[PDB]
């Protein structure tokens, strides 16, 4: 049918929990997506990093097929061959003793919360019910502003703090990059006060900023890591929590459920999705291309009336606009018209988050698409 | 690489969040799974109904392959072709206006909680943050299951927005309720203007012989929760269905998992339900269900450890006299004799094979089960 026909059919038969950009996608490969009118767009969202490897990577599909022909799910009532293969692979790769595989980012977060508090009770000997998790503003809980070591140290003085969880670059806040020395500060303060340092790398991990873990840029080793998105190359909801035995062994059977966590199909996809990442050296690509791409955009938008900031690390980039001077949803809609799809946060900031297999040449074309579009609104 | 090799390897490199039956599976097809030693077992858990259609159904693989070649995920920042196809397919099949697709059964529960409460506030006009959901014990305020009288006492409360109930309690030990419980739930919910929410994540999609267990009683709940077999075990997929008057209270803004409603799930889901309908697996379960449970009842009638043999369609259980047998040991013995399941509450064994199971296979399994029970007799 037409784009409007699909949209209206969703409005009729589906809950109205989202207000999407009105492009109706049917195909995708690498950096590109194709709508029902056969129009091609540069995808600058990468499904929030799930397709870091590019859309529809054939090597990831092939691992998915090879496994799904043999076994897709048996439930955690029994063991499957592929899970331990994945656990061994991931833990060796990232340098932690153990991993706990789940499906979604929210599941990884809740699992981390529980792990942290149980370690708080069982190891830190925090009195029952008192285990506090500290989190950052715009992320028993407490909040601290992001990129603030004084505020952090003040909270962690409390003996009942079990963990601090922080994203190496805040995504939802609008790609906020902390000062150099922040994460070393976090590492130091958390060590001082015997508090778990949890890095949330669900968005920043797996090549997006140019490293396997954005934390690697700062040569700092968190006590706990949360991964997801790109773990699957977009073929399956897969997420993970990693920690050494002194932390992870606090977890015991009985727990709750969520039957699909650790399933053989996800386990096989995951190993291949990371095999692709590493073998194609996509971390190196994002790291090589990202810095120049951003400097170019800064340069070409410097002295644009409507631009407030241009920021990023590797291929995790964003433009902040002055929303009193432009409608940013309209920028997004014009971006789409000019062949590039993204989304904004907080009606201010546009994510610039292409798959990591993007070329220097493609990034030059995208710079021109973006600059043309910002000029239109000046 | 032996079973023990694989088990110890997971103990070393994986969190100890589970304590599974020590069988290490490498392959599965239809009704059967195969371990690392090439031993064959009847799967009598069906990954808790995810594999109603049988393990590794080739048609579902084909739909997965056909979609994934084209598009697996774009996020809900944009539209995808397959999602609206799945939504129209699902809503037309079960007779509700709208569906909300998600990934896990816990996502469907939380979405349902939030939908129920917002309906409560916007339609029922319950006062500021007073909306109360009622659930059953052994499945906020709680009420005993199959207790028509205590249900009425609770819903009297004008602050109650919903009552959520499974047609058969799975996690409690496959508690089959009395007839006219469900008819009387409907009537009471209609009486006091409370949403009647049926949790069919386990019971739905052919397991009890019907597309929804609630169809046995010709009752139409206000909200349906589906999951598990929605995917044929190929993908985590769940759903909440409701008519427009309820569903329209949901506005854009809240985010869950970027994977809810993705094109790959949407295309897998249409085929999983197609397999279910076209292979008449609901019919197979109703048909084969009754006789299978007949035998077990009469073949274990003088077993001193057997407390009860119950169920509907292919959602069955045998409950044991706990004081007399270690029910985990029965499960391990069952495994020895080539049938795998799990128990619940240390007394009840699930008997839930895929729906494509044959009369001749289920005869084999009845002998396996009776043989095993007699070992502990």
Swiss-Prot record, chain B:
Binding to TRX1 may also induce conformational changes that facilitate substrate binding. InterPro entries: Aminotrans_3, Aminotrans_3_PPA_site, Class-III_PLP-dep_AT, Orn_aminotrans, PyrdxlP-dep_Trfase, PyrdxlP-dep_Trfase_major, PyrdxlP-dep_Trfase_small. Pathway: Amino-acid biosynthesis; L-proline biosynthesis; L-glutamate 5-semialdehyde from L-ornithine: step 1/1. Its main location: cytoplasm. Signal peptide: none annotated. One of its GO terms (biological process) is L-proline biosynthetic process. Its EC number is 2.6.1.13. It comes from the Eukaryota. The keyword Cytoplasm applies. It is found in: Cytoplasm. Its cofactor is pyridoxal 5'-phosphate. GO terms for molecular function: identical protein binding; ornithine aminotransferase activity; pyridoxal phosphate binding. Keywords: Aminotransferase, Cytoplasm, Disulfide bond, Pyridoxal phosphate, Transferase. GO terms for cellular component: cytoplasm. It catalyses: a 2-oxocarboxylate + L-ornithine = L-glutamate 5-semialdehyde + an L-alpha-amino acid; L-ornithine + 2-oxoglutarate = L-glutamate 5-semialdehyde + L-glutamate. The modification N6-(pyridoxal phosphate)lysine is found at residue 228. Belongs to the class-III pyridoxal-phosphate-dependent aminotransferase family. Catalyzes the transamination of alpha-ketoglutarate with ornithine or N-acetylornithine and of glutamate-5-semialdehyde with glutamate and alanine. Homodimer. This is Ornithine aminotransferase. The gene is OAT.
